């Protein structure tokens, strides 16, 4: 049985980077070279392995994470990076064995009148740990006075909206991102080529 990579890549809707989705792939066979030869991917840069070599390797579990970010923030979905997305939204470990795939989605995720449904975390007191997912929508406390659920001075809503329009610059255009994570657990390897 082939792996459900169509359900993650060709999905009609994607998540916001702050609430990124995770697909746990199990008990299947995958052609990673069929992925790579889509000629539609603007970024498909694998760290610590190669797409061809992946077809020979076996893994216990494979994770497909997915979200939407700005064009100019795709450089942050990499090991060893800092910035609002890497620090407060999606953090990759510095010891990353996996692939990072991204493509432009301006035709799918931008709308006249602005598509304001995709969000990102702007305020957080501490960087995320690798593969952490902070869905908190509590008001961010910037001063000493407690906020009591009311946005105001020194009290901020922690999420901001991407404004995806059709004619934004490519750096401000939406990009869909899929991060494949490969996992040896001390358990039976069930995803192979």
């Amino acid at each position: 049985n082939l792996c459900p990579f169509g359900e993650v890549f060709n999905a009609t809707r994607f998540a916001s980077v702050y609430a990124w989705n995770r697909k746990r792939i199990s008990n299947c066979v995958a052609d990673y070279s069929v992925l790579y030869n889509s000629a539609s991917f603007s970024t498909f840069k694998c760290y610590g392995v190669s797409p061809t070599k992946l077809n020979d390797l076996c893994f216990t579990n494979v994770y497909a994470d997915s979200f939407v970010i700005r064009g100019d923030e795709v450089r942050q979905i990499a090991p060893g990076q800092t910035g609002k997305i890497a620090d407060y939204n999606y953090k990759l470990p510095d010891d990353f064995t996996g692939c990072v795939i991204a493509w432009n989605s301006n035709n799918l995720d931008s709308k006249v009148g602005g598509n304001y449904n995709y969000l990102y975390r702007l305020f957080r007191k501490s960087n995320l740990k690798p593969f952490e997912r902070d869905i908190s929508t509590e008001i961010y406390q910037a001063g000493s006075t407690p906020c009591n659920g009311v946005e105001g001075f020194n009290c901020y809503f922690p999420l901001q909206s991407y404004g995806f329009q059709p004619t934004n610059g490519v750096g401000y255009q939406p990009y869909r991102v899929v991060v494949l994570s490969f996992e040896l657990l001390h358990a039976p390897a069930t995803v192979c080529g």
Partner: antibody
Amino acid sequence: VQLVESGGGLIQPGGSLRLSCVVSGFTVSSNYMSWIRQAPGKGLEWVSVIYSGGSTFYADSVKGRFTISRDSSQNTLYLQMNSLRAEDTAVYYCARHPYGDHAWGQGTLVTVSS
Amino acid sequence: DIQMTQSPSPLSASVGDRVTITCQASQDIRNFLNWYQQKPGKAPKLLIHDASKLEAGVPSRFSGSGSGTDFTFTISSLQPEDIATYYCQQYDNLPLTFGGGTKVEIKR
């Protein structure tokens, strides 16, 4: 909200100063803050920013020489300026700049001359 | 870097007339444009945030327009105390960059 800069003055080229910015009205360790300088007679130039969670970014004119930092105990922002050059002669401002409610200090003049 | 280009260098008007300062961005910066007023000898003051949103306590004659790469800043009726150097600044993309400045002067 008050922001007060200090630590500026004359210094010979190649020397080091540490600027300070003491904050009243918000928590320096929870907020985005930047250093913006203005050379005498010229315009504004962004120098350094520290993020709410600690990540730091610098202008290209000041990399490897300037370091931005914070102390939560004293609610103070710092700019350690090493290997100073005459082009670094400016009034330096601290600010809750990029994101979060706006605030600017009154500046501290640094002159780099022999 | 994103480079901001302002209405050349000095710009003058009579008391009560209009003044239009234009700011051009090298690339798309959305509505993430700040406008500062700097009176002589004093610190810069944020007048408009997010291209059009007037900060608190700022008189009604100040206003801001534009999205993408071209923006304008307007004083609907210049007052003698509006003598200053006005700066535009993009804040959402790093190397945070300012315009060169536009000095505004009273004609008299």
